[PDB]
C-alpha cells in the first residue's frame, strides 16, 4: 500500500504545516501538524478541556463505531518549546492520504498548553520519530509509520515541504518527479529515538564550505534551523545590523536586509537554503526588526534541522531494519 497527503502551512510565515487526517468511523477528519520530532498522535477531542479550546476541530470517540477506550492508559507529552498536553487513549481507524491502519492509539487530549489552544488551525500532533518515544503508559504505543510499514510497498515516508506553498506527505514509495538530482542517504543513529545524523558541514552565502561534523536531528515539527553558536554568529555575520537579543529570544535582523543563503553537507552532496527562506518577519506587529530562521541550539541540548532547513529538500525517513535519511534538491 501506499499513501498520498498534501500538508499546508498553517501562516505566511510558514510557523508550521498541517495535513488533513481521517480518523474514525464515520470519517472525522482533523488536520494534524506531522512531526518526525515525537512520537505520538494526539488530538483535540470531546474530553477537552472546553476552556482549552478555541477553534480547532474536534474528535469525539463517541460519533466512532470503531473507535474503543484502550482501558487504562494515560499520555503526558511536553515540548521543546515548552508546551505540553496529556490524556486518555482510544484505538480507531487512522487513514493519511488514502493509507489506512487500524487499531491505531488515538492519545485523546483532556489538557493542552495555552500555546496550542491559541493556534486554531492545529487539531493536533502526528509524531513520527522512533515509538521508543511515545509516552502511553503502561502500555507504550506504536506510530502511525510503525502500524503501516509493514503494509507499505517500501518502508519508507517522504517529506516534500513548500516555501510559502502546500506540499505532500507520501508513504511506502519515492516520488522520483518530486526532487531533481540525486537522493544522498546518510546514516541515522536511534539511540535518542530521533531521526538523528551528522551533517557535514556548512557554508554562507557564496563562502567557502567548511567541513564540520554536525550532529542533529530531522524535526518536522520544529520551525526553525538550530544549530551550533559558532555556525550561527558566522552567518550572522554577513547580515548587517543584525544582533543577538536577549530580550527578543534570538537573532533578529534589520528587516530591510537581503538575506545569504546556507548550505549544509549531506555526505559529499549539498542542500541549499535560500536566503529568503531564513526570514520570519517582524518581532511584532509594525517592528523593522525582523526575526531570524537560523538560531543557536545552545540551550537546547541538541541540534535541530527544522523546517527552515527541510523544506529546502526532498527527504527521505527510510525506516528499514537499519533505518537511514536521504536528502535531495528539489
Do not use: M
Not at 71 to 88: C, L, N, R
Not at 113 to 119: K, L, Q, R
Not at 170 to 183: C, K, L
Amino acid at each position: 500500500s501506499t499513501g498520498s497527503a498534501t500538508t499546508t502551512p498553517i501562516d505566511s510565515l510558514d510557523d508550521a504545516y498541517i495535513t488533513p487526517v481521517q480518523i474514525g468511523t464515520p470519517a472525522q477528519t482533523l488536520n494534524l501538524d506531522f512531526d518526525t520530532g515525537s512520537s505520538d498522535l494526539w488530538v483535540f477531542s470531546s474530553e477537552t478541556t472546553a476552556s482549552e479550546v478555541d477553534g480547532q476541530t474536534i474528535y469525539t470517540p463517541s460519533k466512532s463505531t470503531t473507535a474503543k477506550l484502550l482501558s487504562g492508559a494515560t499520555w503526558s507529552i511536553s515540548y521543546g518549546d515548552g508546551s505540553s498536553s496529556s490524556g486518555d487513549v482510544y484505538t480507531d481507524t487512522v487513514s493519511v492520504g488514502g493509507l489506512t491502519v487500524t487499531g491505531q492509539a488515538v492519545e485523546s487530549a483532556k489538557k493542552v498548553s495555552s500555546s496550542f489552544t491559541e493556534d486554531s488551525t492545529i487539531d493536533g500532533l502526528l509524531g513520527l520519530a522512533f515509538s521508543t518515544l511515545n509516552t502511553v503508559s503502561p502500555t507504550q504505543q506504536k506510530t502511525f509509520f510503525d502500524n503501516a510499514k509493514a503494509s507499505l510497498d517500501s518502508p519508507v515516508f517522504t517529506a516534500d515541504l513548500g516555501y510559502h506553498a502546500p506540499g505532500t506527505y507520501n508513504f511506502g514509495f519515492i516520488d522520483t518527479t518530486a526532487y531533481t538530482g540525486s537522493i544522498t542517504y546518510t546514516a541515522v543513529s536511534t539511540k535518542q529515538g530521533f531521526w538523528e545524523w551528522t551533517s557535514t558541514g556548512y557554508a554562507v552565502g557564496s563562502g567557502t564550505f567548511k567541513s564540520t561534523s554536525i550532529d542533529g536531528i530531522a524535526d518536522t515539527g520544529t520551525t526553525l534551523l538550530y544549530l551550533p553558536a559558532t555556525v550561527v554568529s558566522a552567518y550572522w555575520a554577513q547580515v548587517s545590523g543584525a544582533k543577538s537579543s536577549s530580550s527578543v529570544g534570538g537573532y533578529v535582523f534589520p528587516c530591510s536586509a537581503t538575506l545569504p543563503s546556507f548550505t549544509f553537507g549531506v555526505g559529499s552532496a549539498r542542500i541549499v537554503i535560500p536566503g529568503d527562506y531564513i526570514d520570519f518577519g517582524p518581532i511584532s506587529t509594525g517592528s523593522s526588526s525582523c526575526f531570524g530562521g537560523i538560531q543557536s541550539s545552545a540551550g537546547i541540548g541538541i541540534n535541530i534541522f527544522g523546517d527552515v532547513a527541510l523544506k529546502a529538500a526532498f527527504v527521505v525517513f527510510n525506516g528499514a531494519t537499519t533505518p537511514t535519511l536521504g536528502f535531495a534538491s528539489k
